[PDB]
Scaffold this active site. Structure first.
Site, PDB file in Angstrom:
ATOM      1  N   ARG A  55       0.830  -1.197   0.000  1.00 58.91           N
ATOM      2  CA  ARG A  55       0.000   0.000   0.000  1.00 58.91           C
ATOM      3  C   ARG A  55       0.847   1.221   0.000  1.00 58.91           C
ATOM      4  O   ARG A  55       1.501   1.563   1.005  1.00 58.91           O
ATOM      5  CB  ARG A  55      -0.960  -0.092   1.243  1.00 58.91           C
ATOM      6  CG  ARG A  55      -1.983   0.971   1.308  1.00 58.91           C
ATOM      7  CD  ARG A  55      -2.989   0.723   2.432  1.00 58.91           C
ATOM      8  NE  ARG A  55      -4.190   1.599   2.285  1.00 58.91           N
ATOM      9  CZ  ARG A  55      -4.559   2.556   3.119  1.00 58.91           C
ATOM     10  NH1 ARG A  55      -3.896   2.783   4.251  1.00 58.91           N
ATOM     11  NH2 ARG A  55      -5.687   3.275   2.872  1.00 58.91           N
ATOM     12  N   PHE A  60       1.060  10.578   1.569  1.00 57.02           N
ATOM     13  CA  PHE A  60       0.690  10.014   2.854  1.00 57.02           C
ATOM     14  C   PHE A  60       1.762   9.038   3.302  1.00 57.02           C
ATOM     15  O   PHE A  60       2.480   9.406   4.249  1.00 57.02           O
ATOM     16  CB  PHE A  60      -0.677   9.345   2.717  1.00 57.02           C
ATOM     17  CG  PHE A  60      -1.208   8.685   3.979  1.00 57.02           C
ATOM     18  CD1 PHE A  60      -0.639   8.928   5.294  1.00 57.02           C
ATOM     19  CD2 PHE A  60      -2.241   7.748   3.850  1.00 57.02           C
ATOM     20  CE1 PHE A  60      -1.167   8.254   6.392  1.00 57.02           C
ATOM     21  CE2 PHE A  60      -2.729   7.111   4.951  1.00 57.02           C
ATOM     22  CZ  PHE A  60      -2.243   7.392   6.183  1.00 57.02           C
ATOM     23  N   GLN A  63       3.440   1.677   2.903  1.00 58.83           N
ATOM     24  CA  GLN A  63       3.335   0.622   3.938  1.00 58.83           C
ATOM     25  C   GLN A  63       3.820  -0.696   3.376  1.00 58.83           C
ATOM     26  O   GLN A  63       3.495  -1.090   2.254  1.00 58.83           O
ATOM     27  CB  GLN A  63       1.883   0.485   4.385  1.00 58.83           C
ATOM     28  CG  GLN A  63       1.686  -0.503   5.519  1.00 58.83           C
ATOM     29  CD  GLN A  63       0.334  -0.462   6.141  1.00 58.83           C
ATOM     30  OE1 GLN A  63      -0.295   0.580   6.181  1.00 58.83           O
ATOM     31  NE2 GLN A  63      -0.136  -1.618   6.688  1.00 58.83           N
ATOM     32  N   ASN A 102      -0.747  -1.011  12.590  1.00 52.05           N
ATOM     33  CA  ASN A 102      -1.426  -1.790  13.568  1.00 52.05           C
ATOM     34  C   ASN A 102      -2.875  -1.888  13.250  1.00 52.05           C
ATOM     35  O   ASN A 102      -3.387  -1.221  12.346  1.00 52.05           O
ATOM     36  CB  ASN A 102      -1.203  -1.311  15.016  1.00 52.05           C
ATOM     37  CG  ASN A 102      -1.804  -0.012  15.308  1.00 52.05           C
ATOM     38  OD1 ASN A 102      -2.973   0.259  15.028  1.00 52.05           O
ATOM     39  ND2 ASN A 102      -0.959   0.879  15.833  1.00 52.05           N
ATOM     40  N   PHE A 113       5.112   1.600   8.268  1.00 52.66           N
ATOM     41  CA  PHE A 113       4.976   2.493   7.183  1.00 52.66           C
ATOM     42  C   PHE A 113       5.988   3.633   7.287  1.00 52.66           C
ATOM     43  O   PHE A 113       6.511   3.954   8.366  1.00 52.66           O
ATOM     44  CB  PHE A 113       3.583   3.096   7.115  1.00 52.66           C
ATOM     45  CG  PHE A 113       3.188   3.885   8.291  1.00 52.66           C
ATOM     46  CD1 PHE A 113       2.670   3.211   9.408  1.00 52.66           C
ATOM     47  CD2 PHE A 113       3.107   5.217   8.298  1.00 52.66           C
ATOM     48  CE1 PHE A 113       2.292   3.880  10.516  1.00 52.66           C
ATOM     49  CE2 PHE A 113       2.677   5.902   9.429  1.00 52.66           C
ATOM     50  CZ  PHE A 113       2.273   5.215  10.531  1.00 52.66           C
ATOM     51  N   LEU A 122      -1.807  10.395  13.699  1.00 50.99           N
ATOM     52  CA  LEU A 122      -1.380   9.135  14.129  1.00 50.99           C
ATOM     53  C   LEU A 122      -0.584   9.134  15.462  1.00 50.99           C
ATOM     54  O   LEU A 122      -0.258   8.072  16.006  1.00 50.99           O
ATOM     55  CB  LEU A 122      -0.545   8.451  13.076  1.00 50.99           C
ATOM     56  CG  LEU A 122      -1.262   8.264  11.716  1.00 50.99           C
ATOM     57  CD1 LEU A 122      -0.349   7.633  10.713  1.00 50.99           C
ATOM     58  CD2 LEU A 122      -2.537   7.467  11.917  1.00 50.99           C
ATOM     59  N   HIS A 126       0.139   5.129  16.689  1.00 53.96           N
ATOM     60  CA  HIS A 126       1.151   4.292  16.042  1.00 53.96           C
ATOM     61  C   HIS A 126       2.478   4.627  16.645  1.00 53.96           C
ATOM     62  O   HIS A 126       2.797   5.804  16.839  1.00 53.96           O
ATOM     63  CB  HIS A 126       1.181   4.538  14.542  1.00 53.96           C
ATOM     64  CG  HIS A 126      -0.102   4.166  13.896  1.00 53.96           C
ATOM     65  ND1 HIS A 126      -0.267   2.967  13.302  1.00 53.96           N
ATOM     66  CD2 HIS A 126      -1.281   4.799  13.815  1.00 53.96           C
ATOM     67  CE1 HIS A 126      -1.523   2.852  12.876  1.00 53.96           C
ATOM     68  NE2 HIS A 126      -2.175   3.958  13.209  1.00 53.96           N
TER      69      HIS A 126
HETATM   70  N1  LIG Z   1      -2.187  -8.028  11.216  1.00 54.12           N
HETATM   71  C1  LIG Z   1      -1.850  -6.720  11.103  1.00 54.12           C
HETATM   72  N2  LIG Z   1      -0.633  -6.313  11.530  1.00 54.12           N
HETATM   73  C2  LIG Z   1      -0.311  -5.021  11.413  1.00 54.12           C
HETATM   74  C3  LIG Z   1      -1.165  -4.071  10.874  1.00 54.12           C
HETATM   75  C4  LIG Z   1      -2.413  -4.491  10.435  1.00 54.12           C
HETATM   76  C5  LIG Z   1      -2.762  -5.832  10.551  1.00 54.12           C
HETATM   77 CL1  LIG Z   1      -4.311  -6.384  10.012  1.00 54.12          CL
END
Ligand SMILES: Nc1ncccc1Cl
Ligand SMILES: Nc1ncccc1Cl
Length: 165
Positions: A55, A60, A63, A102, A113, A122, A126
């Protein structure tokens, strides 16, 4: 005593692009820094090498770090599937910030990210644990292969990674 430095060697549909290095704020967030550092070296037997930036949203963030499901639903830490939010000392101050993705409180895994804008909303949600040291230009190049919805137009991979110094 010296914060560690890790690198990623980024490729775009398998073609080398360049290197991004990161300072990890082990002095502020040792547990979170150690996770990222060990996943970057692969020394626990798993980690970031060969994974993708699934992503990327221009203006922005980029990730990555989902080496188990490749899409933002997976990843695991070196401590177990998830680990707690270590602290929120450091803030999302601008481009280059390295922070944990997360899915809720205390759900850090492997996904992270790189900010490409200030993302102050954030802060306190985060965990910020590092920053780009060199290759912000490479991140900017990466970022051009994103889109508004985050899907990338080319596959952006961590072709190699590890620890410098
Ligand atoms: N399992 C995960 N770990 C980190 C971020 C988002 C998700 Cl869904
Ligand atoms: N849910 C957890 N369980 C054990 C250790 C760390 C976390 Cl986040």
């Amino acid at each position: 005593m010296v914060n560690p430095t890790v690198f990623f060697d980024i490729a775009v549909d398998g073609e080398p692009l360049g290197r991004v290095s990161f300072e990890l704020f082990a002095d502020k967030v040792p547990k979170t820094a150690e996770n990222f550092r060990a996943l970057s070296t692969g020394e626990k037997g798993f980690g970031y090498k060969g994974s993708c930036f699934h992503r990327i949203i221009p203006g922005f963030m980029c990730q990555g770090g989902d080496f188990t499901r490749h899409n933002g639903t997976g990843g695991k830490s070196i401590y177990g599937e998830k680990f707690e939010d270590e602290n929120f000392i450091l803030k999302h101050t601008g481009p280059g910030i390295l922070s944990m993705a997360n899915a809720g409180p205390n759900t850090n895994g492997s996904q992270f990210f790189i900010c490409t804008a200030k993302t102050e909303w954030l802060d306190g949600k985060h965990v910020v644990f590092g920053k780009v040291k060199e290759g912000m230009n490479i991140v900017e190049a990466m970022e051009r292969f994103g889109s508004r919805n985050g899907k990338t137009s080319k596959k952006i991979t961590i072709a190699d990674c590890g620890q410098l110094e």
